[PDB]
Design a protein around this motif. Structure first.
Motif, PDB file in Angstrom:
ATOM      1  N   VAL A  76       0.845  -1.190   0.000  1.00  0.00           N
ATOM      2  CA  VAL A  76       0.000   0.000   0.000  1.00  0.00           C
ATOM      3  C   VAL A  76       0.884   1.245   0.000  1.00  0.00           C
ATOM      4  N   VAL A  77       0.618   2.163  -0.921  1.00  0.00           N
ATOM      5  CA  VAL A  77       1.443   3.376  -1.061  1.00  0.00           C
ATOM      6  C   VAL A  77       1.206   4.309   0.128  1.00  0.00           C
TER       7      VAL A  77
ATOM      8  N   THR B 249      10.876  36.232  -5.961  1.00  0.00           N
ATOM      9  CA  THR B 249      10.830  35.146  -4.988  1.00  0.00           C
ATOM     10  C   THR B 249      10.510  33.829  -5.689  1.00  0.00           C
ATOM     11  N   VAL B 250      11.068  32.734  -5.185  1.00  0.00           N
ATOM     12  CA  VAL B 250      10.962  31.451  -5.869  1.00  0.00           C
ATOM     13  C   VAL B 250      10.570  30.372  -4.866  1.00  0.00           C
ATOM     14  N   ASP B 251       9.527  29.607  -5.200  1.00  0.00           N
ATOM     15  CA  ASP B 251       9.040  28.509  -4.373  1.00  0.00           C
ATOM     16  C   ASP B 251       9.022  27.241  -5.206  1.00  0.00           C
ATOM     17  N   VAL B 252       9.675  26.197  -4.696  1.00  0.00           N
ATOM     18  CA  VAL B 252       9.862  24.940  -5.415  1.00  0.00           C
ATOM     19  C   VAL B 252       9.287  23.820  -4.564  1.00  0.00           C
ATOM     20  N   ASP B 253       8.352  23.062  -5.130  1.00  0.00           N
ATOM     21  CA  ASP B 253       7.699  21.969  -4.422  1.00  0.00           C
ATOM     22  C   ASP B 253       8.002  20.667  -5.155  1.00  0.00           C
ATOM     23  N   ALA B 254       8.599  19.704  -4.450  1.00  0.00           N
ATOM     24  CA  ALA B 254       8.911  18.373  -4.991  1.00  0.00           C
ATOM     25  C   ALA B 254       8.145  17.306  -4.200  1.00  0.00           C
ATOM     26  N   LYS B 255       6.997  16.863  -4.725  1.00  0.00           N
ATOM     27  CA  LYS B 255       6.151  15.879  -4.039  1.00  0.00           C
ATOM     28  C   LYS B 255       6.618  14.452  -4.374  1.00  0.00           C
ATOM     29  N   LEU B 256       7.767  14.091  -3.800  1.00  0.00           N
ATOM     30  CA  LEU B 256       8.415  12.819  -4.093  1.00  0.00           C
ATOM     31  C   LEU B 256       8.157  11.711  -3.070  1.00  0.00           C
ATOM     32  N   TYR B 257       7.520  11.991  -1.936  1.00  0.00           N
ATOM     33  CA  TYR B 257       7.243  10.914  -0.996  1.00  0.00           C
ATOM     34  C   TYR B 257       6.124  10.020  -1.529  1.00  0.00           C
ATOM     35  N   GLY B 258       6.341   8.706  -1.427  1.00  0.00           N
ATOM     36  CA  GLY B 258       5.420   7.757  -2.010  1.00  0.00           C
ATOM     37  C   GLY B 258       5.311   7.827  -3.510  1.00  0.00           C
TER      38      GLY B 258
END
Length: 347
Positions: free
Chosen positions: A24-25, A177-186
């Motif tokens: 299960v992820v 301004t710079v905002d970086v989102d890396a949704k790499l969990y699971g």
């Protein structure tokens, strides 16, 4: 003459995921609902006894988890839900999340809060190869203020692992301004690998400062919003042989040394006021080659002004900056070539 009616229904519990499921992820939807009744208590614990948070969607027919889970962990439901007749029936169940083949860590090269020059790339370096680079890139969002056009591009993997770079098409406007989102969990990186952790980074672009470095001119100009603030006599590589040619194209400043001791392909030297403009051994520094040489007191004054991410436009040279020179070469290629190193289509 008496009752003869068939009893009200038993509660119907539906578990997502279902009882006994493995693989299960940890960011999958985790829920439990009941029809023909409402929950009186629900909780989810991991194997160690830690409650995992969740709230009931209204008219307590559903309970949903509101935080991600761990890998290779078994979760158990405990609770009860009461039916129409009044009797409570248990909410009991199990499941187990994925254990990945390996967990691929990553990291940005800048710190949250950093102020960088108008040409700084965002660099994410992993510690493994990556099989499904498109799956990972689709987990990347960049949000700029003001909004600015850019793209993600993968460079050839280093020894540490795969690595992906985000570049604006033109220079950042000073102050952005710079905002970086890396949704790499699971997230599956393919071949059984999974992301180690969600990552996020906030930083700001600083003042606009551009170095104009026309090799045939024996000067460098440093130009901000204040105009030409430095116009120094200098000298570049003699360009006898190729090792002593200052590469053509837009460089990026990375590191700088008040006082430095180096030994790597050129000969070996120790110097003062060095501003690194390539991982190939090019610097703006003092000489009293490859590099740009200034008087010691002009090297110092530039050295103090400079910032990670500042662009250095070198013109009038016969060998263009390249992957062979190491980072940062992201600005030495046109935009159509940059969008072509995305693992995705080229909108």
């Amino acid at each position: 003459k008496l009752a003869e009616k068939r009893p009200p229904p038993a509660p119907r519990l539906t578990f997502r995921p279902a009882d006994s499921a493995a693989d299960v992820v940890p960011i999958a939807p985790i829920s439990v609902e009941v029809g023909d009744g409402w929950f009186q208590r629900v909780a989810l614990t991991n194997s160690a006894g830690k409650v995992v948070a969740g709230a009931y969607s209204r008219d307590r027919t559903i309970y949903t988890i509101t935080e991600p889970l761990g890998y290779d962990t078994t979760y158990t439901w405990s609770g009860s839900a009461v039916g129409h007749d009044g009797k409570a029936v248990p909410v009991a169940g199990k499941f187990t999340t994925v254990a990945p083949v390996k967990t691929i860590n990553a990291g940005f090269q800048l710190a949250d809060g950093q102020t960088v020059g108008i040409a700084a790339p965002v660099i994410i370096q992993f510690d493994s190869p990556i099989s499904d680079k498109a799956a990972v890139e689709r987990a990347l969002t960049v949000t700029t203020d003001p909004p600015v056009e850019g793209g993600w591009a993968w460079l050839p993997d280093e020894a540490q692992g795969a690595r992906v770079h985000w570049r604006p098409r033109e220079y950042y406007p000073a102050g952005t301004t710079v905002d970086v989102d890396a949704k790499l969990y699971g997230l599956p990186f393919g071949d059984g690998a999974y992301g180690a952790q969600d990552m996020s980074l906030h930083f700001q672009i600083g003042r606009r400062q551009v170095v104009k470095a026309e090799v045939s001119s024996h000067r460098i100009q440093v130009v901000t919003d204040a105009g030409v603030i430095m116009d120094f006599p200098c000298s570049y590589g003699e360009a006898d042989l190729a090792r002593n040619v200052t590469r053509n194209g837009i460089h990026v400043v990375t590191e700088k040394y008040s006082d430095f001791y180096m030994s790597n392909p050129a000969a070996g030297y120790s110097e003062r006021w060095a501003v690194r403009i390539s991982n190939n051994g090019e610097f703006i520094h003092a000489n009293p080659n490859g590099c740009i040489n200034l008087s010691t007191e002009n090297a110092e004054q530039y050295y103090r002004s400079a910032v990670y991410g500042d662009p250095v436009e070198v013109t009038g040279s016969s060998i263009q900056l390249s992957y062979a020179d190491g980072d940062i070469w992201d600005w030495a290629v046109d935009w159509d070539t940059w969008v072509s190193m995305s693992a995705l289509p080229p909108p």
